[PDB]
Design a protein around this ligand. Sequence first.
Ligand SMILES: *[B]([O])([O])[C][N]C(=O)C1=C(O[C][C])[C]=[C]C2=C1[C]=[C][C]=[C]2
Length: 263
Amino acid sequence: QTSAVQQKLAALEKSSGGRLGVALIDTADNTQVLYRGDERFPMCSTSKVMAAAAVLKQSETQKQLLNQPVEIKPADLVNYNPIAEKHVNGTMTLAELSAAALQYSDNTAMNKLIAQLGGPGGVTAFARAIGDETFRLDRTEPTLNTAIPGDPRDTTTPRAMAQTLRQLTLGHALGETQRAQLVTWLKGNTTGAASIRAGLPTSWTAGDKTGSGDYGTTNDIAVIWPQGRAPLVLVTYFTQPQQNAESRRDVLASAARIIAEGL
Ligand SMILES: *[B]([O])([O])[C][N]C(=O)C1=C(O[C][C])[C]=[C]C2=C1[C]=[C][C]=[C]2
């Protein structure tokens, strides 16, 4: 069946010229709204949530892990490292790397999280351990953002990512302290105001992680606390046919606005 909301998302997609994927979980009743919910999309930096969560899980049995120093060398810098560059020839703790990766989308920080987990497959392994059979991380930064159409590397589906974000931020995939820490990091994100958040009523609060890559890939995954109702989990993925396409955060805001108006 096709709902009014799905029809509106299709119209938005048609006018955008790209491919849009949406997955909403409304925890007020556990219902879901999906648009291309089972198609694969390149995650780009939204994958950093899985990596930070995997490290949080390891910290449940190692009380001092988050305070563990990790060396940052000149050779570790990649294409975007706003936080890590300040620490070259120095160190960053795993908590500092997680916060930098999540709140500023630092790529060097993400690579340190991936390394701590034993490589991209370590992130995938954690996803499997928490019930996500779809997610796959195959490469490090910055190549995991190539976002080539048809390429299965570093992809997931909106349905799977929404389910996983719910389990991580509202459920019990992580211990209570770690869940709280992940939510605190997401709510402190600095990069999301033009994405999902721009399509929501101003009174609502939320935590999110954005993603950007080639083929104008523009992503955002969010946990949302609407005014007067149970939380929502929303994933909005968008990718375009040309490698050098421009970013379209407004399309994500438009998708979020349609979802909100459909409540
Ligand atoms: B994540 O998606 O925020 C990290 N993204 C990238 O490193 C990246 C961007 O985003 C600027 C931070 C734009 C275009 C790219 C990127 C990586 C590889 C190819 C193209």
